[PDB]
Design an enzyme around this catalytic site. Sequence first.
Site, PDB file in Angstrom:
ATOM      1  N   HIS A   1       2.531   8.747  -0.058  1.00 58.00           N
ATOM      2  CA  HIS A   1       1.297   8.618  -0.827  1.00 58.00           C
ATOM      3  C   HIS A   1       1.452   9.468  -2.088  1.00 58.00           C
ATOM      4  O   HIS A   1       1.943  10.599  -2.037  1.00 58.00           O
ATOM      5  CB  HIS A   1       0.084   9.133  -0.057  1.00 58.00           C
ATOM      6  CG  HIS A   1      -0.215   8.383   1.208  1.00 58.00           C
ATOM      7  ND1 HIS A   1      -1.130   7.354   1.264  1.00 58.00           N
ATOM      8  CD2 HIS A   1       0.240   8.548   2.473  1.00 58.00           C
ATOM      9  CE1 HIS A   1      -1.229   6.918   2.509  1.00 58.00           C
ATOM     10  NE2 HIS A   1      -0.408   7.628   3.263  1.00 58.00           N
TER      11      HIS A   1
ATOM     12  N   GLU B   1      -2.560  13.030  -0.132  1.00 61.11           N
ATOM     13  CA  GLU B   1      -3.844  12.721   0.482  1.00 61.11           C
ATOM     14  C   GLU B   1      -4.564  14.029   0.810  1.00 61.11           C
ATOM     15  O   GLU B   1      -5.720  14.232   0.437  1.00 61.11           O
ATOM     16  CB  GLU B   1      -3.618  11.871   1.742  1.00 61.11           C
ATOM     17  CG  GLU B   1      -2.956  10.530   1.389  1.00 61.11           C
ATOM     18  CD  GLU B   1      -3.409   9.418   2.280  1.00 61.11           C
ATOM     19  OE1 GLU B   1      -3.065   9.445   3.483  1.00 61.11           O
ATOM     20  OE2 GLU B   1      -4.124   8.524   1.780  1.00 61.11           O
TER      21      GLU B   1
ATOM     22  N   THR C   1      -5.422   7.217   7.711  1.00 59.31           N
ATOM     23  CA  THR C   1      -6.057   7.224   6.397  1.00 59.31           C
ATOM     24  C   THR C   1      -6.169   5.853   5.742  1.00 59.31           C
ATOM     25  O   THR C   1      -6.537   5.757   4.569  1.00 59.31           O
ATOM     26  CB  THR C   1      -5.354   8.182   5.442  1.00 59.31           C
ATOM     27  OG1 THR C   1      -4.063   7.658   5.116  1.00 59.31           O
ATOM     28  CG2 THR C   1      -5.199   9.572   6.112  1.00 59.31           C
ATOM     29  N   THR C   2      -5.847   4.799   6.484  1.00 57.48           N
ATOM     30  CA  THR C   2      -6.007   3.431   5.970  1.00 57.48           C
ATOM     31  C   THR C   2      -6.675   2.676   7.122  1.00 57.48           C
ATOM     32  O   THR C   2      -6.521   3.057   8.291  1.00 57.48           O
ATOM     33  CB  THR C   2      -4.658   2.740   5.647  1.00 57.48           C
ATOM     34  OG1 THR C   2      -3.927   2.541   6.867  1.00 57.48           O
ATOM     35  CG2 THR C   2      -3.816   3.591   4.677  1.00 57.48           C
TER      36      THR C   2
ATOM     37  N   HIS D   1       6.166   7.158   5.596  1.00 60.38           N
ATOM     38  CA  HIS D   1       5.795   6.450   4.379  1.00 60.38           C
ATOM     39  C   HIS D   1       5.277   7.477   3.394  1.00 60.38           C
ATOM     40  O   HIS D   1       5.221   8.661   3.725  1.00 60.38           O
ATOM     41  CB  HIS D   1       4.728   5.383   4.675  1.00 60.38           C
ATOM     42  CG  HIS D   1       3.475   5.937   5.274  1.00 60.38           C
ATOM     43  ND1 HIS D   1       3.282   6.029   6.635  1.00 60.38           N
ATOM     44  CD2 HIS D   1       2.367   6.467   4.699  1.00 60.38           C
ATOM     45  CE1 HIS D   1       2.110   6.587   6.873  1.00 60.38           C
ATOM     46  NE2 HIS D   1       1.533   6.863   5.717  1.00 60.38           N
TER      47      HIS D   1
ATOM     48  N   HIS E   1       4.312  10.995   5.228  1.00 64.39           N
ATOM     49  CA  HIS E   1       3.712  10.951   6.544  1.00 64.39           C
ATOM     50  C   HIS E   1       4.723  10.381   7.539  1.00 64.39           C
ATOM     51  O   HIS E   1       5.265   9.288   7.329  1.00 64.39           O
ATOM     52  CB  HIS E   1       2.433  10.091   6.543  1.00 64.39           C
ATOM     53  CG  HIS E   1       1.278  10.728   5.829  1.00 64.39           C
ATOM     54  ND1 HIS E   1       0.209  10.003   5.344  1.00 64.39           N
ATOM     55  CD2 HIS E   1       1.023  12.025   5.523  1.00 64.39           C
ATOM     56  CE1 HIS E   1      -0.656  10.823   4.767  1.00 64.39           C
ATOM     57  NE2 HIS E   1      -0.185  12.059   4.866  1.00 64.39           N
TER      58      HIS E   1
ATOM     59  N   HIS F   1       0.810  -1.217   0.000  1.00 64.78           N
ATOM     60  CA  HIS F   1       0.000   0.000   0.000  1.00 64.78           C
ATOM     61  C   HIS F   1       0.848   1.273   0.000  1.00 64.78           C
ATOM     62  O   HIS F   1       0.339   2.363  -0.272  1.00 64.78           O
ATOM     63  CB  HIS F   1      -0.935   0.004   1.217  1.00 64.78           C
ATOM     64  CG  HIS F   1      -1.768  -1.233   1.338  1.00 64.78           C
ATOM     65  ND1 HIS F   1      -2.649  -1.636   0.355  1.00 64.78           N
ATOM     66  CD2 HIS F   1      -1.821  -2.181   2.306  1.00 64.78           C
ATOM     67  CE1 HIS F   1      -3.208  -2.781   0.712  1.00 64.78           C
ATOM     68  NE2 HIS F   1      -2.722  -3.134   1.891  1.00 64.78           N
TER      69      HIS F   1
END
Lengths: 223, 223
Positions: A90, A94, A173-174, A88, A107, A63
């Site tokens: 994205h 986001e 957010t996951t 990590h 993040h 992910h």
Amino acid sequence: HWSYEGENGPENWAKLNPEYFWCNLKNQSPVDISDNYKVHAKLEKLHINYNKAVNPEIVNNGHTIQVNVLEDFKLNIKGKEYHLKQFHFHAPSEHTVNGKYYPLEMHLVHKDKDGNIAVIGVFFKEGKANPELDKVFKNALKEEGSKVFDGSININALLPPVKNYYTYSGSLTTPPCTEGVLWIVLKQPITASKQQIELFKSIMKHNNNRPTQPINSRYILES
Amino acid sequence: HWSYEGENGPENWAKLNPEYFWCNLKNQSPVDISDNYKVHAKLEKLHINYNKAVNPEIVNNGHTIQVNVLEDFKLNIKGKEYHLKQFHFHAPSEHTVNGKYYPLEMHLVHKDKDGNIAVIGVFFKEGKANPELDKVFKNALKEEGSKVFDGSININALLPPVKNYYTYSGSLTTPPCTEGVLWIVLKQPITASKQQIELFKSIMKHNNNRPTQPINSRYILES
Ligand SMILES: CC(=O)Nc1nnc(S(N)(=O)=O)s1
Ligand SMILES: CC(=O)Nc1nnc(S(N)(=O)=O)s1
Ligand SMILES: [Zn+2]
Ligand SMILES: [Zn+2]
């Protein structure tokens, strides 16, 4: 298993597992950081110095590409002492700012002794390449799995010099999308080269950003 | 059925009914309005004129004395158009200010066309008697039930002249404790006589204030 599209997409995360009930609540992340509900205020100064993480673990968990640090970097804010655990990425970002997406968002995930979570977000715009990013993206496995990076990463180089920020109460957010998360999104984006951004995107194979969520009764503070 | 003490007390509301899962989340009300996480900001001015409610319904629902209004009083704030539905009372107060409880707190409950809720809280300290309060407390049934008040209530007389306020994202303070509630607590308390306060307390027979909840990752804004 959840994903960023199809039946197991963000819209149905709450149906995948009972523990994902949070994904449908009222204080979810990410959000559009809009002037409509953003207020300026005198906020606590952000004091962080993430010198360098030696031999951190680079993980492709399907992910995102995550970097687990061994050191104990402290983030003291809002009456708590959070400890950095990992950062990590994205792509696209986001959070958005007045509707604008950035190509990449990092993040920095922290947790205090009681399990409280604080996440610092950093936007990246296309431009001069960032040295540290190559260390992460070029050493990340193309398939799910972890690997120890033979070297060190200067996390401070993954942050903008000026640390003015936006803050609001939100969630992960996951899944499970737990709320009570303290979000701190740095206002100043830094740069990443087009190649660095595309490398990350090509490894992920798809966008890994959750759609923005309703701000509901929350205001966003801006330092 | 839930109550303010015993097995069905606030500490176990979430165990009473599946729909009460909210009572255990991260954005609950009430809260201690503490200088530690309160920030001053330029906020939207509160524009409300609750002229008078004619022949409102006075309800003793066992947990409070509530007044249901027939008119359509509007509260326009934070991009929404909320409509006043009713006001009720808690003794002692639910919110505290730097640890201080007030003897009485009034809640003006509004809802917009989409079901969004906004609650305006008003603190009462002991002092000069409030005319309107007698209309409510002296006409409220001593047992559960409703009654139509033969007269009108000037709601504006139940509000302080200056309407500076605190605001934060929270919840309903009784099951199901739904979140996403917009709280607006007026900073200036008004007065109620010792007799008015005791009359309400004697009708309730017990304290009807929920314990303050952890502020978690939220900040409280002060106009
Ligand atoms: C294990 C862990 O940290 N899970 C997370 N889920 N979402 C996160 S995020 N994108 O909000 O930083 S971190
Ligand atoms: C039906 C209804 O209005 N329920 C409420 N529950 N708690 C409320 S409060 N104390 O937060 O105003 S209103
Ligand atoms: Zn993330
Ligand atoms: Zn109430």
